[model samples]
Target: NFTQTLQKDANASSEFYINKLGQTQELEDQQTYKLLAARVLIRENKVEQSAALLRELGELNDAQKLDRALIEARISAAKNANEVAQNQLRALDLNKLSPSQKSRYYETLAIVAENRKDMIEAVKARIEMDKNLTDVQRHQDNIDKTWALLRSANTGVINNASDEGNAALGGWLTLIKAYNDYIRQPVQLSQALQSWKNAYPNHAAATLFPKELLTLLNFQQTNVSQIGLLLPLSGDGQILGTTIQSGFNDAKGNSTIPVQVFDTSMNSVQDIIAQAKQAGIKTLVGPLLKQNLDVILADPAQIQGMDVLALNATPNSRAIPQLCYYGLSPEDEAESAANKMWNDGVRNPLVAMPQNDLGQRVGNAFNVRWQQLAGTDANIRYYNLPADVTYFVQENNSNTTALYAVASPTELAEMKGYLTNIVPNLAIYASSRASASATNTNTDFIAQMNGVQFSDIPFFKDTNSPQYQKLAKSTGGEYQLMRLYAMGADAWLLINQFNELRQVPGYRLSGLTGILSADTNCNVERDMTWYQYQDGAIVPVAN
Candidate 1:
């Protein structure tokens, strides 16, 4: 009766659908008419009658597509009935449904699960609902696990530990097992990690495990001393100067050390010397570039009274007696590889290069360092490959095959041909430039030298490493200045304990690069490692 009164009012002022249905004569008994009455009641916020009409339509089997959709929607719209509707929808065989239908089905289920406080399950349901979901499925799953563990741990629902030691112990063991089970193995590990995270949703071991593991794994054996940094704080060295400064700052926070920064460009050498004297600096690290070294060496009075350990292997004659250099000269690196080859019973090592000044320097340095490390042999043979003239020219040498330095791709191919054609069993020890060539994606110059071995500076390998990337892109002037920064930090670490360094024999200090100690001549002798190129990158090669 209220329905008819409302319809009459609706018809008088507006275009009413009920009036168009011509329902006045048979309205009382018509099911469609009753459904329209229920819809009007629902629009007016009267849910009881709306629900009754839906039940009646279902009972009468007169539920059309719109009616059934509305009935389901209304059930979900109610707080108490929403869960039942969701469960029923989820139980339905969705495989037979069209893509659009499946999307709608899963969407409704997501809302239901979300309301029930099961966010992870809701996200999983929504992921299933998407037709174009392949790329995001794995990512969503990782996110779900990450957030779920974080939330549970934050709420203290995860087991509450009173101290850090207990947390560390438990977290490490669990993380190690998780890593072994998940990381070391492939198929079973993924499933195991998912299940483990799900089971221990509230476990503190799951949430704080990674940080604890990092602490345990990264514990260094060598004693870390204060690190000095000499970076260009002005002019061309500003960018690299800032990067090395940031690295020392971060390391100070993460480890036990005090860092001292000096602006090489902005400050006079007199100011640096004065500060070092006042600070009682014992170990010095750097003034990186050749130009800065030239300036500093010319005015050694600026650094008087400061006997600091310097890592300055590249310094020329003027830097001697005042500072120690500890880097591998390109020649020394190649020579180390050659010495290894000679020890391995290969007397002759064929070396390759670009045939430039760099090539010549590498050859000369390798010969000098190798002779110093390994006894000079009268049987050692050398070959100078100057540009492409490719017939066999045998020299007067006692060893097997001569060292060949090939510069270009054509030259590399030529060298390969010469080796295959003329010299067999000619072991090759390459230059560091060879590895750089291999990383060049534009051409495969060094890939052809895969079987060759060489020695090179361990370029810090970590693409995701912000520190390494910054250092790689840093300007040469900045690199020079940061070496000073490192030296400053090192001085800060050791100044107070100079007596200890002198009294204790064979005492070594470890800084960012590697273990460092001084020889009788006060030259910093760094025990360097050997590496070879593999898979487009340089890897440490065992001798």
Candidate 2:
């Protein structure tokens, strides 16, 4: 009768019968139906009677034991005895039951587990619950099932174009695995496009995925009617700034985004931002240094709105609410390299950093991010090489020459001695700025320090590319021109899709150096390409 009433309107007798009956009178004739009737009471928040009835019946029927325990746990939780509730729920695992019993038990247990803040177990119970029901299992098995079907369907593509297929699948698989493992939110349907490309390399999926995934990646593109670039075009950073401006010039011809350059060195960052606002600049590119970032970030006046994409790779957290930074930072690059290295089976990593102010700053940032991605802190070593031999010996405590100026050989030998004696058999990794040639030339440096690895920006490898040539010419062959050339090219690349890319899932873009993405703090996550210097040049070990 209670079950029939539950079917008709589950809330009908909730307040009157279940709520009032137990408190008002002893209804001994309804002993068999008490627990069944208490189910409706619990549904209507009449928790006291429901809990009492279940606990009483739990002693009579072994079949009702788990149900009583689970109900008791819920009531405890509702009464705010969270720890007790947890213990009770933990005692009700389905492993003790037969298959059929376990199936029903897990289905009910999952509902309780979800309310108990145990997601990992809840997902497991959900999977088991679906497996018990043939029809539900069919529709519920989406990810693993879909991936398996897609992989099987694309067997032809994999066979014909293995490398392309693998690359495509790797991207999809990495994205999928990331969602299932870390993100655990709604996954991008565009993952289908990536799988399609992986399965059919020569098909339209390869060409179309970038466009289609934009929507899934949370990007909205606009035909660039006109764009503006604001950067440090002079002063101490002039040469590098000019090279980046040239990249924008190059991209202007190719992209529908009409690009314009504004020389910001003549004025302050505030002036630059104000001028851009006045000029109706749809999107903006730079202001390379930290000071410029400060001015842009402090625009609380909504001087720059949501419609404009302010893309740079070097954004500070305080700067994020106003603009998006697309520049690759040393920290992000180091993390990316470390992630790849760890994933590739390099467990123990040692970092060598320069000992000066700039070096310390870069090294500290790199160390923090590298450890974060590698999932463990790496052993760090500081190599404080002098700006000159005079400074090296004067500043270094273990200086072999207190008053005598040491030769490059003597300095190198001393460093080698420290490395071998103090720390041995460690896989050494150097920052982008550390010089290998100077350290290597001293006392069998190559032989003494074998198996050492380094990571640097891509500019270190190819200095003769057409883009580099244009950058060099544009910057008038300024010293340290190559590094500037890269910075310039990177600035252009980041601003090209500033708005659309700012919202991309994981907010990543692969650039000349490595992949560029932003953390929640708006700090740029740089992709660092791994390289090893051999035969007088840096060779790429991994992209």
Candidate 3:
């Protein structure tokens, strides 16, 4: 009766045993009560009392000694006596412990390693736990723990540790490091992947790389030796086209691939396509004007065996099989803004836009993307010029964590002034219009619009980089021309590394336009750098 009562209620049993200890005459019975009392004390977190009881029990058997050691280790860990806990655990002959006891031993070691942020040791413990776990849930839990630890661990440290003949751990570390490099530092990816292949020739990750890359990009092998560029060489769009061509030429930089430019103003779309095909051009890179693109796309039969990358995007256009769109569309920027805000941990975002087509288009893009990401429904407010700045500032709810405002620089400055006064702490996100192009020298206006965050081409923020400096010198700091120049350069770069960008999901090129990647529609998407107006200059935000 006492034993069953002790099993159910340690405190009640502990009290009863202590009270009855004096009455009990037998030595063996007294020793049994002492063990029970110590266990109850430990369970009740009275470690000092349990230790005193354990000390008085002389000549304990092997099982009783193991229980005392385990209890002491637990107490040491609880009290942050990590060295003592580690020593006690290390002294235990793990083979003699039961399966559950061994599992607990490893779990305790993992906990200690985690407390110390010793990722290598923590991973080792988790791996051992994975091997010993017979239960499905426990095995999965260990795997999750290992994956999380691997992600948080420094790849350099893991690589160093794994070099000491830990092949299994080395393989995981190498694969994760390779993937991380692929996403963040694409210039080193090929070398990293090749090293991985050489290190683990028989590894599944190495063997599966090519197929995975292909599926990811829906990529088809193409012999990209010659590219045809169709643009207006002598018309209203001539200056824009020529600026883009200059950017492309600078980006090509002694590349062997010959680019044949055809004037769309001189010939029909069909004639240009035929001429390009005859010239052995396997890739096409323009039609900068939307109207030209529409004409070409209108007749899908006009497309040859070559793939076309149109510079301008046309919404509601039919999907042509071999055609891809890459444009500086307002809608794309708005969507990017939504993604940025969501990543910034803004759940409930409010939108303010002008009461016009462009405004509605930008606002709608933000709303759709926000909802798709499981954010709250569109909390959109429209304003007209001679803008109702007060209406937006005063009517905004206090609970709105973030604001997405799509307006011109003048309107943005006005709105920001009002919002800063009312909701000073609100996270305000905007598009490129809020900040002028790279060459804008309006320091006073920018300084006034402090606390407004926006995204734009990397050229604006990174003026000190060689590429930006070179372009500025050549173009004499023509802001709009420099932007097109970046687009042109990125377009040329994209052609060369198309497969790599598509296959690796997060792979991006750190170009003048921004970090460029291809979307599912094969359209080039710009993951622009974030900027907040701080002090007198717009500063780049660490992503």
Candidate 4:
């Protein structure tokens, strides 16, 4: 009677059954009551109690044993004892279960696999569940779960699963690979889509692939003809301006579009805009100084007709139509460093910063972003010149898993020397300020910063690339100037691909500076390369 009551409503009738079962006069009735109570406990999510009660069931029949094993597996999975759950499920003969029991078994198996992060096995279990279910709604739910799993997995993991000869997984992998390739290599999108269709001609996902491909194809058809460059070409800033100018010119080596450069020193930004408009320039790039950009931004009429991309970026700066900002911001590098450290399993970080405005800004940005990701603040310590590094090291908390610092190359070397002596095993991450210029011929300072990791533009990371080598040769080994050169060169390329970059907000251009992508705020965010100091030289860290 209690079992029948449980079949009606497990939650509402569980208490009534337990109360009546306590007064039962027969041993068989007591055993039946306990079995029903165990099932009720499991439904209420009291898995440990359910498992304990099931184990107390002495001399269970085959049907009762099957039910007991299923509940036990569910309990193990809920406890995150994935290995025990997986072994329990694998030992069962699935064919012995009823159709509904088979469905429940595979559902639990899928969840256990997911808890273990074995996505391939999770998908396989769901596919088997779909096959075992006869109800249309339940079958559709399993299909939906499989698609959700496939979407969350990256192409590498999906491709690995496809190699096992599962038709359903292979079909999903084909679609994902085509989409990834199209975004990364837009020129061959049409070919890639066609190739995917040809390979999986009759696949179920083929019906929807064309719609997605059309959206990407339409995004790549934006046009721009001429761009204007504004810089201080004949003033105290002329040396830095000329370095950027030369890099921009070098980048335009074979492009047919006319790139007109205006010297801001000779004329006001207002005058330059008037000349650019008269010359039919629809897009403008430059005015590297913050003051010049501020002046231009103060007057909205100055950038009415043209789309402008400023080479200098200011924090929290609002952009109007056809206006965007991109620059080598220290805050960006610091934020990136925080992300890297968090991904490296760092929960608590001891941050050491120089005692200056720039250092404070970078350190603050890192702390804010790290707290957002890790759900807690980082321990921060600020130091002045001739830093007493021992003071910071001694104050470091026991929970600190890593070190994040912002300092110039010389300051970085000092901090590294102290860290190496005190906490050699602690992983250290820093911003681009610690990066050395290509022209720096000193190997002695690098040894001091050994084991330190930092983020920087590709100009310093990829010296072997032809584009970098060409710029290096042309700049005559002026490493600091060459960095400006690469920045100017990237600005040129960004202007040319401005429409493509805007249309596909996440599209990246592998320019000499870094891999550039446009953010929602119309700012060009650079995904710089990571490097670690080793063997007297900074080496690239593979992602």
Candidate 3 residues 331-354, lDDT tens each? 777878888988887777778878
Put down candidate 1 lDDT per residue, 1-543, tens digits, no spaces: 333332121112112433544655644335455555555564465668567756765333322333345436544644446657666675555554545445456655655665666554554555455432233443344334333433333233223423234433343234335544343233344455555556666554354333313222322222335445565778986765565555445445566565566677887655765676677654444554456655556766666645444324443533343454444345445555566666666545445444466666666655665566554532322346632323332333236544535344345545755665454444555544444432444335445555555544333333357654565455342333344344434443443334233322244665543344444444443333456545455567752
Worst 10 residues of 3 by lDDT: 1-10
lDDT tens digits, residue span 258-298, model 2: 66676777788677667767877756666666676667666
How many steric clashes does model 1 contain? 37
Given candidate 1, what's the lDDT at residue 482? 42
Cα distance off (Å), candidate 1, residue 131: 96
Candidate 4: which stretches are off by over 4 Å?
Answer: 1-220, 368-373, 386-389, 397-400, 437-440, 461-476
Per-prediction count of colliding residue pairs?
A: 37, 7, 0, 0
lDDT of 3 at 111: 71
What C-alpha RMSD separates each model from the true structure? 28.6, 14.3, 13.2, 9.4
Order the numbered candidates by lDDT, best leading: 4, 3, 2, 1
User: What's the ranking of the predictions by TM-score, best on top?
Assistant: 4, 3, 2, 1
lDDT of 4: 0.72
Off by over 4 Å in 3: 1-222, 317-319, 437-440, 465-467, 473-476, 502-504
Which ranges in model 1 have alpha carbons more than 4 Å from their true place? Answer: 1-228, 237-247, 254-258, 275-283, 299-301, 318-322, 349-364, 377-420, 437-443, 457-520, 525-527, 533-539
* Candidate 2 wrongly placed segments (more than 4 Å): 1-219, 254-257, 300-303, 306-315, 318-322, 351-374, 379-417, 421-424, 435-450, 463-480, 535-537
